[PDB]
Structure formats: C-alpha cells, structure tokens
Design a protein around this ligand. Sequence first.
Ligand SMILES: O=C1O[C@H]([C@H](O)CO)C(O)=C1O
Length: 721
Amino acid sequence: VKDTYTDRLDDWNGIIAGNQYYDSKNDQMAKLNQELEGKVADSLSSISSQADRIYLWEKFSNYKTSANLTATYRKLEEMAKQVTNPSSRYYQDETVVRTVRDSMEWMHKHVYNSEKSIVGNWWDYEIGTPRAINNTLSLMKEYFSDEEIKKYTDVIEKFVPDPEHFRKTTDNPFKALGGNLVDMGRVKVIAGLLRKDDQEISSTIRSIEQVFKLVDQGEGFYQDGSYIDHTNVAYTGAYGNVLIDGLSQLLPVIQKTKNPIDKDKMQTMYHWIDKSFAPLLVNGELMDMSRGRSISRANSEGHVAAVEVLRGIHRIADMSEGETKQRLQSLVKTIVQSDSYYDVFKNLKTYKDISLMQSLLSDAGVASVPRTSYLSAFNKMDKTAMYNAEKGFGFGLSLFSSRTLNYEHMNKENKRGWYTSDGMFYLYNGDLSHYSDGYWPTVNPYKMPGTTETDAKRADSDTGKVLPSAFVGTSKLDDANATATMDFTNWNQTLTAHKSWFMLKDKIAFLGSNIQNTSTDTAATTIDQRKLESSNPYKVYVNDKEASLTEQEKDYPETQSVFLESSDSKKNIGYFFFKKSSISMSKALQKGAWKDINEGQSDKEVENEFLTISQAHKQNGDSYGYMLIPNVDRATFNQMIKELESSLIENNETLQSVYDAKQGVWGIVKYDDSVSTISNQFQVLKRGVYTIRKEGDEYKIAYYNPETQESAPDQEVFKKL
Ligand SMILES: O=C1O[C@H]([C@H](O)CO)C(O)=C1O
C-alpha cells in the first residue's frame, strides 16, 4: 500500500507497459497504442456478459486446453495497460476497471485456483498465466487491495512454490535453468513484490544467478557460444531469446532491491551477446538453424525472432555505461539498419522499447558501421555460422551428432523438420526474405538443401534422434576459413555418406563420398532448393548456356556448372562441379499451409516457387563434389571456375580435400589414421578435421578431433614434407 514494493512495481510497470513514456505525437508509439486499443475493444465486445457464464471468451472456452488459460489472462493484461494510460480511450473507464476486477474473481473461482491441478501443458499453469496475472495486478495495483492481490497470487504459490524447479506439483518436476529459469524470476520476483514477500524475492534472485554461469555439459551457454536446451537441442535462437529478453526486463528491478546482482556476474551477459547471439544475426535475421521448433510458427519468422534478441541487447546497453553501452548500441544500430526487409518497430511492444530504439537510431554519436567478416564454429551444438562482409553473404551449416538431437518436433510443432540437420545449409544473400514469406510451410521437406537422402515416405508423428556417430565437427582456422564433416547415417540406417564442407572465404565446397544405399528407395543429394522472387527472376545457365527450367524434372548429364543470374549480383548463385556430373533441375510452384507443420497454425494455403537442383546416386560408393560461389556476376563466375578447375585434391572413403590456391589454404577431412601427403608439401597424420594456411615457408594449422572434441599438438597431426 504505497511502500518500497510499489516503488519497484512502478519500475516494472514502466518496463512492461511504459505508459509514462507515451507521446501521442510519436508516430511509432501512437501506432502501438492503436493496436492495444483495438485489442481491448474486441475483448470488451465479445466477453460474456450473461448470468453464470461458462467461459469469459468463447475462443478460449475450452479450459481443458492449457492455452485458453493464459490467452484469457493475457486479455486482462491488455486491459490493465490501457486503463492506466492517460491517452487511451479506456483511461480510468469504470467498465474496464470493473471488468478486470470482476474477471479476476470468476477465473479464480472456477478455473485457476489453489485447489486445482495442472491440465494440459504445465507451462501455462506455472509460467504463462502467472506472468499475465502478476502484470495485471502490478499495472492496476491502485484498483486492488493488498488482500485481493495476496488472494489472487496464492494460486501461483501453489503451482510454483519452488524457484529452483518446475512441475513440482506434478509427479516429474524438473530443474529450472536458462530461458525457463528467467521466466521463473518473472513469476516469483514480481509475485513476491506484489505479495510483499522479502523471502520470495531474495530466494528467487539467488536462484536466478545460476543463469550467469557457463556449462561444459547439459543445458545452458557454452564457452564456445553454443547454447543448448531441452537436454540436447541447439536452441540459442528460441530459448536463448527468452533468457536475454526476460532477464533484460527483470534486471533493472532486481538491481534496485536489497538483493542486487554483482556487476561481474553480468560480465558474462556481454559474452552471450558477442559470442552466442551476434553471429546468428545476418541482415536482421536470426538464423533458423538455432530456433528449433519455432521455425514452424507463422508470426515468428527469422527477422521477427531477431527482434526479441535486439530489444534485450538494447535494454542491456541502456543498463551499462561508457564504452560497453556505446558498443552494444552500435551493434543494435548497424544490425537494425542493415535490415531493408523487416521494420524492427513491428516487434517493439512497449513504449520504453520504442523510445529506446528511436533515440538509438537518431543519435549521430552512436556509430553504425557494417559488421565485419566472421566465422563461428558452435561445436557444442553442431552448428556453424559464416559471414563475408566484403561480398556480403551469410552461410549456415546445420548438423547433429551423437551429442545432439537432429530436430525437435514437440507440442505438435515442426512436424516435418526431419532433415533440417542432415547436413542442411543456409545461404543468406541479397534476398533478405528468402526464409520468410511462408518458406517453411512451402519448402519440400524431403529435399532440404545440402542433404543426402532416400525418397522413403516419412511420418509427421516421428520425433528427433541423435546420430550414431560422434564424428561431426568444424575445424576453424580463422574468421574466413574452416572445414566441417559429418559421418552421416540416415534415420533408418539404410544410407550413409561422408559429407564434408570447405568454407574458403568467398565460397564453400561440398564433398560427399562413400554413399551407400541398402534399401530399394532412391537416393539423391539436394544441391539446392531456392525460394524464388517473382520480382527478381533468375536466368539459369547450365554449362554457361541459357537453359529453360520446367516443373518437370529436366536431366543434365555431363554438367560442369550451373549459374543462377539475377539483375542484382548480390543474389547470384553459382555451382561448379569439380567433375562433370549428372544433375536434374526443375522450377515449380509449391503450396502448403502452416498447419501442415504446426497443428496450432493456420490452415490458410500458402505458396512459393522453388528452383530444385539434385544429383542421384544409383550405385554404392557414389559421391558428389561441387563448389558454391555466391554474389559474383556471370563473367567472374566463369573466371573463377577456371582457377578452381584443379582445386579438388581428393574425395574418397578415407580422405576429402579442397585446395584454394589464391589463398594458399587447404581444407582436409581424414576418416582414418593413415599418412596423407597433400600437394607434395606436407603430410597429415590423424583422423579428424583440418584447415591449413601456408604463409611463406611457414604453415598455420587448425586441427580438430570431433569425436573427443579436442585439438592436438601439431607434431601429432602435421608433418611438413
Ligand atoms: O515454451 C513455450 O513457448 C510456447 C508458447 O505458446 C508461446 O507463449 C509453448 O507452447 C511453450 O511450451
């Protein structure tokens, strides 16, 4: 009742709503206010106003489905925001004030109280709903009595009494870490501020600290930047988001309590941003390979997901000072400005976040220079991110091994992500909307780019698996060159292939050998499946001769090269086959719906055109070998393949190697411990992945053993000839 807790709750309110920063003459703020007003109007004109109703809102009447619980409270929160906004048409409106208060009671008496038990997802009973309830009582604290707040938060205590574990009410609770651990703070630090429970605050804060540590196993952030969740899933771009997004919201309040958090523990926060998040952001897009099952959500495509991270970073920068505040500010500014496809404000949902972004972008003192080149090998989550600032393209390598799950199909989401980690690659170029605009529900799940597979049908009911082999990993020499491999075996053990990738600054070689098939199904590797633009059509050249592609698969034997020519060179893609190969191509309209891959999504039909290139393997001991060259014009491409006409050093069952003469760099993958002499210059001696650079008479070496996850002394793996 107007004490020190209300002081902290006031700060929270300024963070989650920020009504005190509202300015009607502010274009962006007025827009968001227009959105909230419309939400509250729709909730008010559709709410049940009859005697003894059986649902507050019919669209969320089935209180057997966990979602209907927090979606219902989310509506009362939106009302709490407008009722306290002086510029809203619902400011201090008696019907809104009474509706909220009245609605808290009904839900409490008949749907969510202490004498209840989890039904559906636990997430809604412990995180979603409790969060929406906390925010509502905080925003409207001047309309509720302390006793009413106590009474209304008691149920949160029942379901979430332990700030260390979740599902404590059920039979199989679990330890809270990472994203979920941060959501625990949003539930118990606020509920504790509302209930004026000092014990609850200190113990949840004390428990939040756990997040500030790095891990060498299990869930959490690794020192190499990888972030794992759900036991063994690469998840920086989804659960990592929740972590930073939520922690950046809480910190300001936490720090003003009697239990602040050590300035050094937050030193690691800057590490996550620089080592984990930043590399996954390309032209404002958050690489899908790190978003797990969220890739199947229509309203959370790459550019939109990226904004959850950016606003968290922004909030953190604002907490810092001096250089740190400056550098984080420029990181956010340059990324936001490099995004010509998505409007960042479309995902800044509070007035403080909008105000912050505006200050940032209009401040000439904050630098905004193009990000420089970089290559991150997240070996702890079997992902690899590469970015070339000079030519301007990004590249992502999605793998998995015995240490990680290939794909997460859970809660009925991402039903067909079967091959998204079977050596699938991502190419981020001039077309910033490639993986957006319905790419996921329209891409053929059976031909993910870069993957070798049989045409056997797959079931939506299937779920993730780990790889039998641990020989999966990337050897990084510098920020422009690296080598990767995957001792691949498919889902039903009927196909194998030694797949290797050679990232050489401005191109990537794809080598595959030892391809074997014991099934009757047909086997082939998808060189590419690119989503086309009706605006920037491609002129296709095979062997440098114009070709006309059809929906029908056209076969091109003796193919030495394929070139996709756009009017914008930053969208061109070339494929040089080290040895004339038999490939087939087709261009076709592919239709689908989001519901097809996520039960909770829309059934509305979506469609996009895709250009598919693939190579069939009709024999045991088959292989493939091609160089991918993006962002160069036709004439340069033709020039480059002339130089690379001898870049293939080897590609068989025990050794794969490509040589970049212009750079003096070698990419090498050895599957056995025999001695391999390379280019009559040196010898490599151990199973593993190498990336070597000759500098004068000296050699720079980068060796990595994927199985043991260790490097090694040079003399054990390399011998100069
Ligand atoms: O962690 C989760 O995120 C979603 C959610 O629907 C977003 O509110 C959900 O389904 C989970 O179990």
